[PDB]
Amino acid sequence: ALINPQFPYAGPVPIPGPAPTETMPLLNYRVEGRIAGIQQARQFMPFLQGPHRAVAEQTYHAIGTGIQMGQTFNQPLINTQEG
Amino acid sequence: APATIAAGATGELTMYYWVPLAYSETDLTGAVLANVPQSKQRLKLEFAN
Incomplete structure (x- = not known):
């Protein structure tokens, strides 16, 4: 702010002001609020809580069976070298 | 297999x-x-018919 003498800035907005209204009042709000609809315990989703496999491992079962059977052919006898 | 089998002919095939x-x-x-x-x-085995 600058004040300049001799033209000085009025020393106030004075008493000639026009009170325009008495509408100043905010009427307090008084209220009762009830949000009470029956609630049912459940919601349907496509899927909740699953941690789906991105790849599975290979998996398997097992079997064996049979017996011990055989047809054989042997090497001929040979002269013994030494000993 | 014969390339063609003419009318009235019999062809022999092996596969x-x-x-x-x-x-x-x-x-x-x-x-x-x-x-x-x-x-x-x-x-x-299912053969041709």
């Missing part, structure tokens, strides 16, 4: 197929242990 179990003569991947214990193998 061979190798049904593999083992991958090759040196790679036994896929081979089947069939020791003589009696549960049977089944080789099903």
Whole structure:
């Protein structure tokens, strides 16, 4: 702010002001609020809580069976070298 | 197989197929242990008609 003498800035907005209204009042709000609809315990989703496999491992079962059977052919006898 | 079989003719054909179990003569991947214990193998063949 600058004040300049001799033209000085009025020393106030004075008493000639026009009170325009008495509408100043905010009427307090008084209220009762009830949000009470029956609630049912459940919601349907496509899927909740699953941690789906991105790849599975290979998996398997097992079997064996049979017996011990055989047809054989042997090497001929040979002269013994030494000993 | 004869390239063509003319009207009234009879042609003779020969075909061979190798049904593999083992991958090759040196790679036994896929081979089947069939020791003589009696549960049977089944080789099903459907021919032309």
